[PDB]
Ligand binder design. Structure first.
Ligand SMILES: [Cl-]
Length: 111
């Protein structure tokens, strides 16, 4: 539910940087995704749901590793999906795997 998605897909590292500043103080969830990745697609509806539920305190940014290889390399991504949580450019936490409960827990504990 909470359809649509406030899940913006970054186009490049500069675009990501600009997205982070716009996020201001809000918790940022970087979702490293791939269209060919089964677990990544399985967790997508959850991310859409969360983006809407926490629109006031959270910004979900989708990073396609095939299109933004630099970003993936920068955050040393290897597992898919991988969630990196940031606030004011500071890394709060990170974990890999399509775990819906864990994703919501991290956001609830960091807003
Ligand atoms: Cl739920």
């Amino acid at each position: 539910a909470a359809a649509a998605a406030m899940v913006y897909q970054v186009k490049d590292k500069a675009d990501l940087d600009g997205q982070l500043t716009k996020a201001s103080g809000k918790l940022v969830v970087l979702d490293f995704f791939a269209t060919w990745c089964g677990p990544c697609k399985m967790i997508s509806p959850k991310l859409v749901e969360l983006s809407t539920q926490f629109a006031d305190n959270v910004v979900v940014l989708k990073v396609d590793v095939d299109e933004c290889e630099d970003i993936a390399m920068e955050y040393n991504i290897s597992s898919m999906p991988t969630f990196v949580f940031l606030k004011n450019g500071v890394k709060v936490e990170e974990f890999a795997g399509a775990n819906a409960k864990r994703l919501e827990d991290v956001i609830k504990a960091n807003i």
